[PDB]
Symmetry: D2
Subunit: 337 residues, 4 copies
Amino acid sequence: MSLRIGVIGTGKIGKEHINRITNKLSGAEIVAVTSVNQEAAQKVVEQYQLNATVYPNDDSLLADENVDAVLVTSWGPAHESSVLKAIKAQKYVFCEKPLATTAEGCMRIVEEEIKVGKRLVQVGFMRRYDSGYVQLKEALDNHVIGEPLMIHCAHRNPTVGDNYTTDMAVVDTLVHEIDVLHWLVNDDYESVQVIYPKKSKNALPHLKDPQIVVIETKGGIVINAEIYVNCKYGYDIQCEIVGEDGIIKLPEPSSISLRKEGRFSTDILMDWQRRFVAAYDVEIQDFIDSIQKKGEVSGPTAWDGYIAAVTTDACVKAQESGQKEKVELKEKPEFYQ
Amino acid sequence: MSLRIGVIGTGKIGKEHINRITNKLSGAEIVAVTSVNQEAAQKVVEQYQLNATVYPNDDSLLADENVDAVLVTSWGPAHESSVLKAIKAQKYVFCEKPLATTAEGCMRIVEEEIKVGKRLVQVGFMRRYDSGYVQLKEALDNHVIGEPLMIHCAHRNPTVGDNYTTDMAVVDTLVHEIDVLHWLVNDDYESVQVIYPKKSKNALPHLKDPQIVVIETKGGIVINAEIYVNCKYGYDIQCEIVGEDGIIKLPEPSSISLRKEGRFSTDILMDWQRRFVAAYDVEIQDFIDSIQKKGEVSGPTAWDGYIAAVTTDACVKAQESGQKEKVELKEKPEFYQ
Amino acid sequence: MSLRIGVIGTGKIGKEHINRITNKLSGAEIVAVTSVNQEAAQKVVEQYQLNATVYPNDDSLLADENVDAVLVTSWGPAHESSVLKAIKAQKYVFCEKPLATTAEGCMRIVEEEIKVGKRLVQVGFMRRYDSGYVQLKEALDNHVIGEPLMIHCAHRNPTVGDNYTTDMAVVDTLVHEIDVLHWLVNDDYESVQVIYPKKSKNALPHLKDPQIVVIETKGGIVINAEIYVNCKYGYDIQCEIVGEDGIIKLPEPSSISLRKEGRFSTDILMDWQRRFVAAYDVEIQDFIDSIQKKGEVSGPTAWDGYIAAVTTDACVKAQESGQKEKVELKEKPEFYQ
Amino acid sequence: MSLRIGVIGTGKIGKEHINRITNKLSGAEIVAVTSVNQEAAQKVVEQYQLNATVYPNDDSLLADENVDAVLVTSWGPAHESSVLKAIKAQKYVFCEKPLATTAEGCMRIVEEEIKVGKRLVQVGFMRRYDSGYVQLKEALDNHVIGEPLMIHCAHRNPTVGDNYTTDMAVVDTLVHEIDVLHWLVNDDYESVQVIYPKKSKNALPHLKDPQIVVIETKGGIVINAEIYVNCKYGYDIQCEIVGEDGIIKLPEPSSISLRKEGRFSTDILMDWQRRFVAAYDVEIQDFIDSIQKKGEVSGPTAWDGYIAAVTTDACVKAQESGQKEKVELKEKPEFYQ
Ligand SMILES: NC(=O)c1ccc[n+]([C@@H]2O[C@H](COP(=O)([O-])OP(=O)(O)OC[C@H]3O[C@@H](n4cnc5c(N)ncnc54)[C@H](OP(=O)(O)O)[C@@H]3O)[C@@H](O)[C@H]2O)c1
Ligand SMILES: NC(=O)c1ccc[n+]([C@@H]2O[C@H](COP(=O)([O-])OP(=O)(O)OC[C@H]3O[C@@H](n4cnc5c(N)ncnc54)[C@H](OP(=O)(O)O)[C@@H]3O)[C@@H](O)[C@H]2O)c1
Ligand SMILES: NC(=O)c1ccc[n+]([C@@H]2O[C@H](COP(=O)([O-])OP(=O)(O)OC[C@H]3O[C@@H](n4cnc5c(N)ncnc54)[C@H](OP(=O)(O)O)[C@@H]3O)[C@@H](O)[C@H]2O)c1
Ligand SMILES: NC(=O)c1ccc[n+]([C@@H]2O[C@H](COP(=O)([O-])OP(=O)(O)OC[C@H]3O[C@@H](n4cnc5c(N)ncnc54)[C@H](OP(=O)(O)O)[C@@H]3O)[C@@H](O)[C@H]2O)c1
């Protein structure tokens, strides 16, 4: 019957996932809430009419035996702590990115989970659940294009706020590409390099934008990723995989077409929140269903969180040094193989 | 909440709706089933692990006061009888097409609903809930192309069985177009004409396929619909609306692209079930949510069912006469505004 | 050496053809011109720096023994006379549409050419030389889609002058479709029907625009053609051929794409003269080349002119009567086989 | 009257140019040819039925006072020689790439031309005359997308023979991109870097294919160019320019579309000779018209040839070293401004 879920962190995306579980998905219910702000957390149970005790902290909510699983949706740097705790409490955990702000912290989560002996942790890299990326994965697995040789991608955003900084280009933005690409081609990153084109007029003086990130896999796949967060025209994810015998490419989001005033056109999304809305529903549903059927989670793993953490670090180092940097990856544990 | 739902008819679409409510959607559960094969209904309850009572018939299912609403997913020609009974028992009813196999059948349902004083009946014309059609209607209502003048559409299917007959081209197939178009442009159908191109080699000698159906609305919009149920290449829905100042067009379903062996290509679906899957989820969720929030349904009405019935009747007439036929619609009751 | 060409009618089209012959194409030169405004004629000679006599009329131009061939680019109604005179003078003739203003006019020209005993007359239906239509013809002749069953096309124009009349929709505009389609599918027209949507706000009150013209071939191919000469958005030619086993479609004219301000777009041409510029070059070059290589022309024939006339007449009839009208088509002389 | 053209080298490209001049274009004729293969040369004169003299060498041909201009279409390394001889004879010269096999060779040509005092040398970089590239240039010069920041391009080929070497990837292939991009964005190259992904199974082991070349301009435009000469699927040129406020992209070559067997598709050329046939006609016609109207040529210059040589040299340097290499360009002479 219903999977009982506690929510750690009721900001925007905590409110979204709650709405999801309460009003859209099957098999689960929100029974507990927290942080930080005792208020607001109470305002959230109000807003959504929840049968939910407002606990004052992780351990508190995590103490409850009427909670089977948790969503960690709080401030990024807070994640590692709550995840560790929930693992010790042996509850299933869905953790929004990042798993932890350091590779060391991801490694600690990895260590703990391996002790429990089964997969409790799923990281919220929703792109793997998007129908376009699923199709790309299927085509590759069915050897449609032969071996992958190169990947060209772009992650574009119309404009960012004052506080968006150069490192966020890789840490908050490219991390999605970083997680999804190694999954697609099943190969590990080896080296990264960052090249800066002239700065766009739309970027604030403190921010280096756009940038080009070149990544090589151990297999020798070269990825060039454009990141351009002040592109003005829209929010835009583009991904092209070049293989030996052919090329596959991610599709545009669905739009009606329009002939009008001398132009034939389709819409480009302006809002990042509309790009992957279905994927978010799918990943949470899969969280719920995996548990109810397999006694463990199925999505991106604690190791995937670690791979991202390490890769983003090398990228930031590449941003600073302007040189080709190594990606320091431990061999993958048997437990995640 | 938990809307408590009884299913009348546990065939293919019945089982798929049961799956949706049980494993995909929010706010409802299946508590009762009935079918003409009572053991078949039992297997379904087994298969989906339902906490549901198997009833011998719809009368007794409708007698169960723990049943809030029903789905009528039985044999087409039997829908009308089940709907009438559900209206008298005052349950909400989601009826798969058709509502009734005759205009008179629909009119009977219409006046029974008007007696009850609120909306009980929602007809399963799922295209209205498809994002493409929603986008088309949004554009229209925002005056993007001015007044609609012409609609060019096509409904294509790879192949049909031995028992698909000429009348089914309009009754089972074009009926989807007939419902969605008058809704899109807010106009009533006035007349229809059927034109037969040479028979396709892919069609059995008793079937006339393809067909062209020309429809004129009262306001003077002209619709040209191509029906070709043996097109071989795929399942394909196309729709273009030509307005005074511009043209809008329904998108292709999402697909990765492929460059390979001298061709740049995307997928065309082979399977009608894959085309509108999301729409079915949305329509049923809307049935549930409208009831739980407004105490009445919100989708295609019994009146839309009537409109479809009158129009397909005129189309069948036109198939046999080769002449322009009037669509004789009674004025729309104030109840259905 | 050069094919020596005289030009009858030195208005807009006459000047453009003179331009391509003088400055773009191989193997010909203008040696004579005539008009009606004997100032503009002398003017064109100087503007294009031509070593050419200006004559006062066709008779005197056709008298000139060093003229090998003529282009008839005069006022529409005057074409027939000049073509006839040229045939009697035994000169080759490229005649801009229309060959004549009546089917009888076209038939007369057909008879004189048969008397001359070889092909002198090429009619300027340039679409057959457009690379997109050439590709459609080639796909059809390679049996890529099976037998053609239906054709859907549109001929759209941003706006017309107040002189444009309802009959001109089929006589001046659809006549291009009428020619190209029977050529593409190698079939004769049998019947036509015209349906009027409500009048567009962009159309003057005396003009019925847009129009839908339904044409059936003897073999049972059904053509649905949309004509909309005040569509505002652009000049647009669309053509989709539905065959038994698949569908082929004319491409958009080439254009860079643009992502900007929330839209992904390509250009739609605003003026008809840019649409087929290459085809005009190819058709004239073919006129020159065929004459020099074979001693007769090879393009659209006087008989093709006749077919267009008879089909347009039947369309004008359908315009007035609102009924299905027969295309009164005489049998094709072996001379044109 | 006619520009009298001599052709040096009657290989494949030489033959094509003779064909367009003799049978397609305006205002010139072939009056002289020479080739290392005498029989081939005389056979070309028969084949195209030329009114031309076969000369045993370029000295003879260039000494012919009835020769106004020459096309140099001989073996690559022999180009420099013929170009210098032609400038000395003060003949107009269309030189197929490369201008010379070294930057030194090009510099000597630059030197001799400046002495003459006018432009005699046009280099055969035809992409500049392609309608797609012209539209890109027009959009950029109208500042449709603001300042260019990044360019992503690809040059792909189905297969190469056993002669093709790693250096030819930049020397014979990328050289087209190298010329067209600095022309598009009006900026000079600064540094280049080469990255090798894993080798394609379609490549002979003596060849490194594919390659990624990264070029920075002095203004800070970053260019990422994929070269892949055994991509199997087709010949394919892609080019996307990312600007501050928008993105413009080269179109696919014109193709009809096809729906068939579960795919919606367009053709991809397999044959490089088909991608740019129109550009070749336009470039040669430009050569002829510029001479006849301005007394000097006006396409890509000897200086453009020199840029290509230096930039290609540095790319080959980067190929061997694996490091970011400098493009050492001298100051552009006033003669070429
Ligand atoms: N998977 C995806 O596609 C996706 C998409 C978006 C976000 N995320 C991730 O989800 C996590 C949380 O995101 P969010 O947008 O929901 O966060 P949020 O609402 O900004 O943060 C959650 C709560 O913490 C408070 N807070 C945290 N740090 C604060 C500070 N320094 N000052 C003031 N209040 C602070 C917030 O208050 P304030 O109102 O003042 O912030 C809010 O009450 C992040 O790790 C983010 O990267 C993932
Ligand atoms: N909205 C849509 O797009 C959509 C899509 C599909 C279907 N539908 C509609 O939903 C309804 C049911 O569809 P379905 O595909 O589930 O149908 P189905 O499985 O073929 O038929 C449903 C039930 O009717 C019975 N039945 C079928 N033919 C019969 C006949 N000739 N005589 C007596 N009983 C008969 C079946 O018996 P058995 O138990 O022996 O099979 C089954 O119990 C139909 O009216 C159909 O038009 C709508
Ligand atoms: N193949 C195609 O796609 C295509 C495209 C465009 C046109 N065409 C055809 O080519 C022909 C010429 O077209 P256009 O646009 O060049 O036409 P135009 O210039 O208007 O007509 C040619 C000349 O006719 C003169 N004229 C007009 N009315 C006259 C009258 N009643 N009596 C005597 N002379 C008269 C005008 O004299 P002034 O010089 O004093 O004005 C004009 O120069 C047309 O029949 C048209 O259908 C074909
Ligand atoms: N703009 C463009 O896109 C483009 C396209 C293609 C080529 N090109 C350029 O045009 C030039 C010639 O190209 P192509 O493909 O036409 O060459 P080709 O036909 O192989 O050679 C052209 C001429 O050089 C001779 N030749 C060829 N190989 C030779 C060798 N190994 N030693 C001595 N003489 C030799 C040929 O005579 P034999 O037959 O007796 O060898 C012929 O007269 C090259 O510089 C090439 O890069 C440019």
